[PDB]
Design a protein around this ligand. Structure first.
Ligand code: HEM
Ligand SMILES: Cc1cc(O)ccc1C[C@@H]1NC(=O)[C@H](Cc2ccc(O)cc2)NC1=O
Length: 394
């Protein structure tokens, strides 16, 4: 006698389980059990993943409803699941999206300077170096302090909330509320701090005192800062970390991008496509009865959109495990989602990874793992897949 298939399948972020391909072929939508004990529909083909993400009747905000089947416990207030919707309703979407583009004057130069300084420090200390804790994550943190307009020295403390904030837990997490409340208090103080005049928080601080926004809540302004810092830092840091592994595992790609750095954007796009940083499918709750493939999903049921299901689907990306810089459909992957909730930080995430990789390949052309790849320790019960340390030599 066998139990219902459990998700997630593996916390390892360096390879996709052979099981995903068998599942996509045989049952591209099928029932699974989540860590909470709830049942859910796991969707694993490109066609069905796109269908779900483009149909707003599969709702993100409704996943936070009391009594719904859950992928994991909330680590944020329930109203925060609707964060982008609240931003839009407050009239703040254009201003927020403008503040988080990589086009702001000096931002890209700051990123390059920061990456080079981090790498110089590692070279001075000598191999082995930890490219997650001493490169990718500090680069992500520095970037988001700059984007938010907050002091660089405040980055590390905000960062240390994230190993709990992005847990994927069966049960509520007491530490998540402690850190959330503290970080909200911090951002509320930032909005009242007259020295904060640049970046996203500088812009929100101005709009907060503009008569057109006088009824927008101080809670929402603070929440934007906390959530954009957290989502951005965890997403860019984790993506860059696992992209570096994928590059290290491919010496000839590493050498091609070192020799022809103009190919780095196309390389980053393929690294995004094959990336396994999202540890769970994207959750949606059905608000109606909806046919998805051979399954009639019923109102109130949980659907999980498996990004690597779509992104390794050979019907859409032939030879899907191979990084090919000349695909005809290179940005059509789902690494940033699709539809209503498409990632607002997609351009910034691309530039973070492009600049980080360019800098690493220039400073450490001989970069290689300093331990056998099986020795990487993969974080469990987390919303991202990441190795606890990434030891390299060069
Ligand atoms: C490579 C880096 C990144 C990746 C791979 C990534 C991935 C994603 C994905 C897949 C979603 C869709 C989630 C869903 O539909 O359920 C998403 C949404 C989001 N991302 Fe990103 N992201 C990245 C960088 C960033 C950055 C830099 C920020 C902000 C600074 C950010 C903020 C957000 C926010 C706020 C949402 C929710 C948007 C909404 O609900 O409409 N992300 N991200
Ligand atoms: C737990 C948390 C702590 C934070 O500090 C910020 C945001 C999350 C939520 C978590 N993060 C994500 O990257 C995606 C996409 C997403 C949804 C809503 C959102 O506001 C931002 C992003 N979904 C999530 O459920």
């Amino acid at each position: 006698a066998t139990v219902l298939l459990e998700v997630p399948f593996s916390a390892r972020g360096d390879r996709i389980p052979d099981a995903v391909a068998e599942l996509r072929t045989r049952e591209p939508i099928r029932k699974v059990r989540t860590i909470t004990g709830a049942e859910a529909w796991l969707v694993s083909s490109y066609a069905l993943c796109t269908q779900v993400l483009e149909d707003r009747r599969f709702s993100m905000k409704e996943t936070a409803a009391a009594g719904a089947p859950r992928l994991n416990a909330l680590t944020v207030p329930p109203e925060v699941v609707n964060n982008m919707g609240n931003i839009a309703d407050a009239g703040l979407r254009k201003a927020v999206m403008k503040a988080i583009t990589p086009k702001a004057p000096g931002l890209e130069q700051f990123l390059r300077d920061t990456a080079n300084s981090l790498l110089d420090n590692l070279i001075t200390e000598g191999a082995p170096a930890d490219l997650r804790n001493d490169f990718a994550d500090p680069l992500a943190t520095a970037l988001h302090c700059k984007v938010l307009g907050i002091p660089q020295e405040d980055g590390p403390k905000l960062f240390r909330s994230l190993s709990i904030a992005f847990m994927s837990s069966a049960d509520p997490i007491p530490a998540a509320k402690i850190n959330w409340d503290r970080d909200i208090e911090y951002m509320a103080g930032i909005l009242e701090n007259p020295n904060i005049t640049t970046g996203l928080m500088g812009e929100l601080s101005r709009l907060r005192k503009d008569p057109a926004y006088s009824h927008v809540s101080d809670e929402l302004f603070a929440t934007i800062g906390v959530t954009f810092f957290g989502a951005g830092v965890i997403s860019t840091g984790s993506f860059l970390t696992t992209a570096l592994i994928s590059l290290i595992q491919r010496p000839q790609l590493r050498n091609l991008l070192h020799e022809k750095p103009e190919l780095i954007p196309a390389g980053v796009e393929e690294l995004l496509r094959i990336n396994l940083s999202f540890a769970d499918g994207l959750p949606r709750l059905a608000t109606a009865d909806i046919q998805v493939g051979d399954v009639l999903v019923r109102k109130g049921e949980l659907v999980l959109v498996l990004l690597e299901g779509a992104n390794f689907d050979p019907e859409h990306f032939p030879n899907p495990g191979s990084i090919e810089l000349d695909r005809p459909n290179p940005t059509s992957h789902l690494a940033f989602g699709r539809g209503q909730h498409f990632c607002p930080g997609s351009a910034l995430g691309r530039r973070h990874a492009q600049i980080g990789i360019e800098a690493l390949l220039k400073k450490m052309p001989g970069v290689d793992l300093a331990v056998p790849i099986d020795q990487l320790v993969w974080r469990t019960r987390f919303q991202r897949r990441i190795p606890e340390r990434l030891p390299v030599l060069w």
